[PDB]
């Protein structure tokens, strides 16, 4: 599943720090039952200092 | 700022010399010296070692404002957990003092909570702010009418 590994996606999740921000997909989990399989890496950190977050494919579009 | 401008534009109008405001309101040392210092001449001399005037209640209410406003700083600068550990030591001291340990509390003594601390410091700041200016404004116009 997922759009593609190594692709550029835009986050549609409202409560994330990287909403409407360009991110790079580093891992998509193909195991069933995982709610947020797509792991997206960002060039900028959030207030917690991390750049790695998991999103569903419904919360991302290819840009 | 609004009522400083009102009271100094009018306190120079009422005794005639509007040129004092026209020359001195453009810079803040005129505001400090010709308004905050000059009009406070008979304010803080409301009571002296020599005697007390009719503005003495307005001289106490001015100092009273400088207490309460500054007391608000105690709630607006110092925050909760210092006072919580302080009241923890106070609770130990009351629970171990002979003749005073017999007296209990039903409410556990805690520090003021964080929203409550901001509200108490804000209300003290506001009470001191309204009493320092109510006193100065009602003592620097009613003692020097004009």
């Amino acid at each position: 599943i997922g759009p593609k590994r190594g692709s550029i996606v835009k986050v549609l999740r409202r409560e994330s720090y990287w909403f409407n921000d360009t991110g790079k997909v580093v891992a998509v989990d193909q195991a069933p039952g995982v709610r947020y399989p797509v792991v997206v890496r960002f060039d900028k950190v959030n207030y917690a200092g991390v750049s790695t977050n998991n999103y569903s494919p419904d919360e991302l579009e290819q840009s | 700022w609004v009522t400083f401008y009102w009271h100094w534009k009018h306190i120079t109008l009422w005794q005639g010399n509007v040129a004092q405001f026209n020359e001195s309101s453009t810079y803040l040392m005129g505001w400090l010296r010709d308004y905050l210092w000059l009009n406070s001449s008979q304010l803080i001399n409301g009571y002296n070692p020599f005697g007390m005037n009719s503005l003495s209640v307005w001289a106490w209410m001015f100092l009273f404002g400088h207490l309460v406003w500054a007391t608000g700083f105690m709630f607006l600068i110092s925050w909760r957990g210092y006072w919580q550990e302080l009241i923890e030591t106070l609770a130990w001291a009351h629970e171990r003092t002979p003749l005073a340990n017999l007296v209990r509390w039903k409410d556990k003594p805690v520090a003021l909570s964080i929203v409550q601390a901001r509200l108490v410091g804000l209300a003290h700041f506001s009470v001191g702010y309204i009493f320092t200016y109510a006193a100065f404004l009602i003592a620097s116009t009613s003692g020097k009418f004009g």
Binding site: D43, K44, V45, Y47, G49 | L28, M29, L32, R33, W37, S40, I44, N45, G46, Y47, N48, P49, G51, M52, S56, V57, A59, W60, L63, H66, F73, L76, I77, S78, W79, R80, G81, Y82, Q84, E85, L86, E88, T89, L90, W92, A93, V110, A111, S113, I114, A117, G121
Partner: protein
């Protein structure tokens, strides 16, 4: 076992570590990602314990940082001697100092600031200095500005030597950990080599240079015709005409005929009536005695020659039945922790600076120091602020020792473990005595304000109302005035003039010193002082004692020193940290030291400083109003904060108008502090998010993400502006008022 352990070239002298800013910390070595990285870059710049876990490299960093500090102080002294040499009227002031003000700073005539070059006297224009360098150079025997220029270039040479030694003891030959752990040798060479030989060398200067030049300056001799300092050493008959005891020529020193040195080594006491400053025969006997006493005390500890003391053997033999295994491991505290030694040294240096402030208004060591009131007020005020800052930093590094260097395994059942074991009792009884002092001093002030407001002057605490005379101070001042007659025979006069031995010293028509009265007002303000010092001790000692843990947070030592809080839990854990107790003790140091210097300024402008006319009448600056107005807050606001501020606000259009500008800008920095102190991070973070949105709209977003300042950083910025603005307010008001009326 004490010997030199160094090793050669630890780190290569390279600029590649200058280019990477956060090289010292592992978190900052990855580069910036937010704007808080810049603030943690400066916050962790000097924190050498957070860089490495090796105490050897930490101690080398501290040693070369000491050398860099010494280089900065020698650059500063080079500047102040170069300003005396080129930009001062020191020869003009030295011709006659009772009419010409000390000035050593010339401004450039650019934007209207040339009015700040005021008429200080002697055909000179410049900023009137209050640092006391002119009286210090008069006490040093400096006659010409060529000597000031030579001392400036010599200090520049020593500043280059400290920079070279800071490079040398980090990059060429840096000492190892056991070299710094030889504390017995360090105390032996600081007591004997530094404070003993330093006092002996300054005693030799005050025998050969300060004493004859300052004796000729008391005779009215012009400093251009006074012989140069080496002429007293060379022509010893010229030195013998001022003191006949020099005609014997060092033979009474080795034959123990020291009383034949009674011409130039005296125990006089008091002030020179010509100048108003202490005698240099007493200051030379003082330095010779503290040198023959610090050199004796420097031969106490055991280095490697057999004789001496192991101080672990001193400590471990000091154990008592109320403590048990006390004083044991404190040597391991004070040789493996830099912060514990920093706490003790900072407490002694701050308390010592407070000793310096009191022992300089009261026993003025320099000629025409007392009668130049600007110098006395500025020197007392400066040393009180430095002393208060250093004792708050003493409690700071005490708390950092607890959170980062206190090992509980090595400290069982000693003094420190038991002090931690009853810290609730210490903080609670300190809390009681602070509240008791607060009522019994400030509520006494409130009572005086209330009955003075209610028209009851007899219901007050005055010298005419219910009296509260300080009978212990009034007895210790009589004990120090009636001392020379029986308890201290060999004294010509008394230690200070402020004791009660008469001697109304008039220098230049201005009062140097006289008997200082102590009444109800002094009792009230000394109880204010004891109260404020006790409350500062309460916040600071609470932060030291509850740095490890509390009843609230039992794992507070894992959270560190500069952490904001645990969170909104347990009712709210805001400012639980030991850092936040240093942060609040900085405010209580402001309160304590500001009331100390306010009591100082009003007490000596009302009861000491003034003028003497004919037939022995003394008119003070604010005549006799300390005994009646300094018992109420309305008098403090009125006859001190309003009457004496009538020269800082109408100084505009004159040479003292920069004091008016910095008075107002100091009010600005104080009200700017109240922005950081009263607010919090999350509001400013969301406001910065709106500003970042406006930057994203116009494509001017920085990659270094704009962040609000941290909660520890916001409190630090607020207390820095609070201390800077309030201290600069008092600096501007003091240095305008006492220059204007002095």
């Amino acid at each position: 076992e004490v010997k030199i352990m160094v090793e050669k070239d630890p780190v290569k002298t390279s600029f590649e570590k200058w280019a990477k800013p956060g090289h010292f910390s592992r978190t900052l070595a990855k580069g910036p990602n937010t704007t808080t990285w810049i603030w943690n870059l400066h916050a962790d710049a000097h924190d050498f314990d957070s860089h490495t876990n090796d105490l050897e490299e930490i101690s080398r960093k501290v040693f070369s940082a000491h050398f860099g500090q010494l280089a900065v102080i020698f650059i500063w002294l080079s500047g102040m001697y170069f300003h005396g040499a080129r930009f001062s009227n020191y020869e003009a002031w030295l011709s006659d100092p009772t009419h010409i003000k000390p000035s050593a700073q010339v401004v450039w005539p650019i934007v209207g600031q040339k009015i700040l070059n005021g008429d200080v006297g002697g055909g000179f224009q410049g900023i009137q200095i209050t640092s006391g360098f002119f009286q210090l150079w008069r006490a040093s025997g400096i006659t010409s500005e060529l000597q000031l220029y030579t001392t400036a270039i010599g200090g520049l040479i020593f500043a280059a030597l400290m920079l070279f030694a800071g490079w040398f003891h980090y990059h060429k030959a840096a000492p190892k950990l056991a070299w710094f752990q030889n504390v017995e040798s360090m105390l032996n060479h600081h007591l004997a080599g530094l404070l003993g030989l330093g006092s002996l060398a300054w005693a030799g200067h005050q025998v050969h240079v300060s004493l004859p030049i300052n004796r000729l300056l008391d005779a009215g001799v012009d400093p251009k015709e006074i012989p140069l300092p080496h002429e007293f050493i060379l022509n010893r008959d010229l030195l013998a005409q001022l003191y006949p005891s020099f005609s014997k020529g060092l033979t009474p020193f080795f034959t123990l005929n020291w009383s034949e040195y009674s011409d130039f080594l005296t125990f006089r006491g008091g002030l020179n009536p010509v100048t108003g400053g202490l005698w240099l025969t007493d200051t030379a006997h003082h330095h010779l005695a503290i040198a023959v006493l610090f050199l004796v005390a420097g031969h106490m500890y055991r280095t490697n020659f057999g004789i001496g003391h192991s101080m672990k053997e001193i400590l471990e033999a000091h154990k008592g039945p109320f403590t048990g295994e006390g004083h044991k491991g404190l040597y391991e505290i004070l040789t493996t922790s830099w912060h514990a030694q920093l706490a003790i040294n900072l407490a002694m240096l701050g308390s010592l600076t407070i000793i310096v402030a009191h022992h300089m208004y009261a026993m003025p060591p320099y000629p025409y120091l007392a009668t130049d009131y600007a110098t006395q007020l500025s020197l007392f005020t400066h040393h009180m602020w430095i002393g208060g800052f250093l004792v708050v930093g003493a409690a700071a590094h005490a708390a950092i020792f607890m959170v980062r260097d206190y090992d509980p395994t090595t400290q069982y059942n000693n003094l420190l473990d038991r002090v931690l074991r009853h810290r609730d009792a210490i903080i609670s009884h300190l809390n009681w005595v602070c509240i008791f002092l607060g009522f019994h001093s400030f509520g006494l002030y409130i009572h005086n304000d209330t009955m003075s407001a209610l028209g009851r002057p007899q219901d007050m605490f005055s010298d005419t109302a219910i009296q509260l005379q300080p009978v212990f101070a009034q007895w210790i001042q009589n004990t120090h005035a009636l001392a020379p007659s029986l308890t201290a025979p060999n004294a010509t006069a008394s230690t200070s003039l402020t004791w009660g031995g008469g001697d109304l010293v008039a220098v230049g028509g201005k009062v140097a010193l006289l008997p200082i009265p102590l009444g109800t007002a002094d009792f009230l303000v000394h109880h204010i002082h004891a109260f404020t010092i006790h409350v500062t001790v309460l916040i600071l000692l609470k932060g030291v004692l509850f740095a490890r843990s509390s009843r609230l947070i039992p794992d507070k030592a894992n959270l560190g020193f500069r952490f904001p809080c645990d969170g909104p839990g347990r009712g709210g854990t805001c400012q639980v940290s030991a850092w936040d107790h240093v942060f609040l003790g900085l405010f209580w140091m402001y309160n304590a030291i500001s009331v100390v210097i306010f009591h100082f300024s009003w007490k000596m402008q009302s009861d000491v400083w003034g003028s003497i006319s004919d037939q022995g009448v003394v008119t003070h600056i604010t005549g006799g109003n300390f005994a009646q107005s300094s018992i109420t807050i309305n008098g403090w606001l009125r006859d001190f904060l309003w009457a004496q501020a009538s020269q800082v606000i109408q100084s505009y259009g004159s040479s003292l108008s920069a004091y008016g500008l910095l008075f107002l800008g100091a009010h600005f920095v104080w009200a700017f502090s109240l922005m950081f102190l009263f607010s919090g991070r999350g509001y400013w973070q969301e406001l910065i998010e709106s500003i970042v949105w406006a930057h994203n709209k116009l494509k001017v977003a920085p990659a270094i993400q704009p962040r609000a300042l941290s909660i520890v950083q916001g409190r630090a910025v607020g207390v820095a502006h609070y201390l800077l603005g309030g201290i600069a307010t008092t600096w501007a008001f003091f240095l305008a008022r006492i220059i204007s009326v002095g």
